Amino acid sequence: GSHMKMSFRWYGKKDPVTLEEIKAIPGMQGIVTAVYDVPVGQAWPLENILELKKMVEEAGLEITVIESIPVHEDIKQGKPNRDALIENYKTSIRNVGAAGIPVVCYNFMPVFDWTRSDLHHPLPDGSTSLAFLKSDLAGVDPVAIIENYRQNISEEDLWANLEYFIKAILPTAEEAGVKMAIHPDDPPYGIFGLPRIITGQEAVERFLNLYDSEHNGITMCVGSYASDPKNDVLAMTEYALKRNRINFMHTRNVTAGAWGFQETAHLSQAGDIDMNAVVKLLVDYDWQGSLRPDHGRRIWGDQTKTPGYGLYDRALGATYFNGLYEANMRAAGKTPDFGIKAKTVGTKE
Amino acid sequence: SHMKMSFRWYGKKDPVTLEEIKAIPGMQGIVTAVYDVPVGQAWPLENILELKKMVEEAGLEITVIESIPVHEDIKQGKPNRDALIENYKTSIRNVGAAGIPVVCYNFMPVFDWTRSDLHHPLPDGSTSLAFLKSDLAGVDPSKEEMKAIIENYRQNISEEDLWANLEYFIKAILPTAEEAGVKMAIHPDDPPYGIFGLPRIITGQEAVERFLNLYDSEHNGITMCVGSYASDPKNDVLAMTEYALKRNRINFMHTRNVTAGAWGFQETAHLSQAGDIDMNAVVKLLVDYDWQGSLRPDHGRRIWGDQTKTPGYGLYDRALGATYFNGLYEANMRAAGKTPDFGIKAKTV
Ligand SMILES: O=C(O)[C@@H](O)[C@@H](O)[C@H](O)[C@H](O)CO
Ligand SMILES: [Mn+2]
Numbered sequence A: 001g002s003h004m005k006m007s008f009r010w011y012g013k014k015d016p017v018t019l020e021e022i023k024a025i026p027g028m029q030g031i032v033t034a035v036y037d038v039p040v041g042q043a044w045p046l047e048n049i050l051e052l053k054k055m056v057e058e059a060g061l062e063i064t065v066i067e068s069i070p071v072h073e074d075i076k077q078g079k080p081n082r083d084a085l086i087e088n089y090k091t092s093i094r095n096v097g098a099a100g101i102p103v104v105c106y107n108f109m110p111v112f113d114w115t116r117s118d119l120h121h122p123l124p125d126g127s128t129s130l131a132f133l134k135s136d137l138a139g140v141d142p143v144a145i146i147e148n149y150r151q152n153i154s155e156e157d158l159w160a161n162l163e164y165f166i167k168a169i170l171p172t173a174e175e176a177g178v179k180m181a182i183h184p185d186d187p188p189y190g191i192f193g194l195p196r197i198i199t200g201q202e203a204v205e206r207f208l209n210l211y212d213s214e215h216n217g218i219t220m221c222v223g224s225y226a227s228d229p230k231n232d233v234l235a236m237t238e239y240a241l242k243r244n245r246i247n248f249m250h251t252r253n254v255t256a257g258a259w260g261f262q263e264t265a266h267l268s269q270a271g272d273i274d275m276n277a278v279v280k281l282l283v284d285y286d287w288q289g290s291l292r293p294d295h296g297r298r299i300w301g302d303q304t305k306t307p308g309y310g311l312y313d314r315a316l317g318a319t320y321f322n323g324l325y326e327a328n329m330r331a332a333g334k335t336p337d338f339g340i341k342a343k344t345v346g347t348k349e
Numbered sequence B: 001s002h003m004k005m006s007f008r009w010y011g012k013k014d015p016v017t018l019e020e021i022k023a024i025p026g027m028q029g030i031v032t033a034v035y036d037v038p039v040g041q042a043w044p045l046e047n048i049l050e051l052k053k054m055v056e057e058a059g060l061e062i063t064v065i066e067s068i069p070v071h072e073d074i075k076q077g078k079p080n081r082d083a084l085i086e087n088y089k090t091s092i093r094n095v096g097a098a099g100i101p102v103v104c105y106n107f108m109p110v111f112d113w114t115r116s117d118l119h120h121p122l123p124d125g126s127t128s129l130a131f132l133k134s135d136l137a138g139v140d141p142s143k144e145e146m147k148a149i150i151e152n153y154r155q156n157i158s159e160e161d162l163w164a165n166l167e168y169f170i171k172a173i174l175p176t177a178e179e180a181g182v183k184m185a186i187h188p189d190d191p192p193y194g195i196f197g198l199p200r201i202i203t204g205q206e207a208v209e210r211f212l213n214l215y216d217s218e219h220n221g222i223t224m225c226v227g228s229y230a231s232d233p234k235n236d237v238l239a240m241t242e243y244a245l246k247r248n249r250i251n252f253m254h255t256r257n258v259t260a261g262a263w264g265f266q267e268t269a270h271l272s273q274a275g276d277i278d279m280n281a282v283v284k285l286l287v288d289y290d291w292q293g294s295l296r297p298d299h300g301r302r303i304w305g306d307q308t309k310t311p312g313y314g315l316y317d318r319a320l321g322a323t324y325f326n327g328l329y330e331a332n333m334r335a336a337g338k339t340p341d342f343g344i345k346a347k348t349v
């Protein structure tokens, strides 16, 4: 049965938005966060991880996803030395497994985690948001590694590098107790001369096939994949569900076609994704994991300076998904849960 | 078959801007009222346009006038009523001369609402309005004029008397409302039982039935505030909601979540498993019965440093409700065979 834990990303002590605040989003169960005091490829110690946990539980919550142990460019290049970095990932995994966290989320995106033309792009309703102006500055160098990718590393070269990678980490992930969740390349296509392999359905099916385990899975970022219209999320979500290989939902909305993409409000009809259908699937498949609103719009006074990661609209997403999940569960002859235990503190009957 | 997603606005003085109100996903209509005429007087169209001009420029549309206050001299049956009904006449007529289809209101002695506590702590760390019966036992409620108005209702105004004065007032203003467009929507009393020796008569199913019948006509209806009525456990809001949908008698939906008992009542997150109301059912009914009016997530908790000192009118949890309802509607619409719809026109500028 669907134990779908609603979640929020939180960057720790240094976040604009606080734990207490997140706590006040009704239905909110999980925290999604990362150890930030240790260089990429370098290995997370148990104590950085136990210090996040200690805090998160202190504010009546639990870390459901560790979002991103950063995958070092050397591994992404497949340079001779990677085994060194790779082992640090194993210690990271292990120690996550040692803090009682079920799911680590990563990406094998060379150089560019995301590409964003406009951080302040207007929208019909008056909000600004993130968009991908396919024309604007794009198709031009963003002023060593890049030319290595540009020149030698092919998609299949990157594929094999990735095969290498996860073939080395999994038996570890399996003994730690941690399911791996690859986050699609964002945008779901190669640009800037660099390769992006993790592009859609066939990519997932080769990916999933690299190591055949529930521990080896995807973070179904339905908004990322979908921002190239060539790929189709419902059947993509559906497929992974079918095979039992989603260990993390991101669930944000974005609008697109052959012109490029813009991020928008979460609500099904402010963009190309029918979000109802996405979750209705999570219902029918009794799916079990954490979904985050993930990215919002800047609305109201949101002084959150960092890009798409302010509290307000993200929280708006979340109760919208609460409403979606609430609904379909009953509609399914089921009873949805949000981890709520007390209604009151100090009356009841 | 479409419910318009609405939100209440206290006029020019509202610390919550229309831009912020416009910022909510799927938000459409505006719920507001005049503030510059003393009480039982006229409402010049000019005052209502001076507020409608401010609004449709900002993207929004008056879908209800939330409250022209019926004078006490009216409810009290005092002789001087006819003139103060003559000025409630104009109000009624002038409003329907500005496209606005619905006017909400109440017939409640002495106070529009009561609460023992304007900041009661909830389990998720936030604070919401509450009526704790016991904390308000040891209270004796112009000022002398109050000590006078209260004394009258206590001694010489029975329940039947208050029904009396409601009918006289109702068969007065109903023609005024039908010759204007305006559909009339009564707010149940809050709490939906008598307190401080004072009578209430808009309390439950039994009473809704008598009300409708006072004047059998579609522009003679109610505001279905599931929250007010569910503060009393003996009430069954699901059946109440259905009953009135059948008679075409719901002219506006408030949609607020409470928890309750013999102890009294506390307000909570709009989400169902936080309080005592199965919200999904209530919107489901709204979808089974092709309901055409507008719904307002009512009151919200005091979340996220929100510095609004007004009952439950802050922006955030009021807005978090909105989007929860956005989810529940849509989600249900698609299980029915219906296509939802919000304020959505152009996904992108
Ligand atoms: O039933 C109630 O008390 C609510 O509908 C409030 O909207 C009320 O009318 C006041 O405006 C809240 O202070
Ligand atoms: Mn994402």
Ligand SMILES: [Mn+2]
Binding pocket: B225, B228, B254, B256, B298
């Ligand atoms: Mn109300």
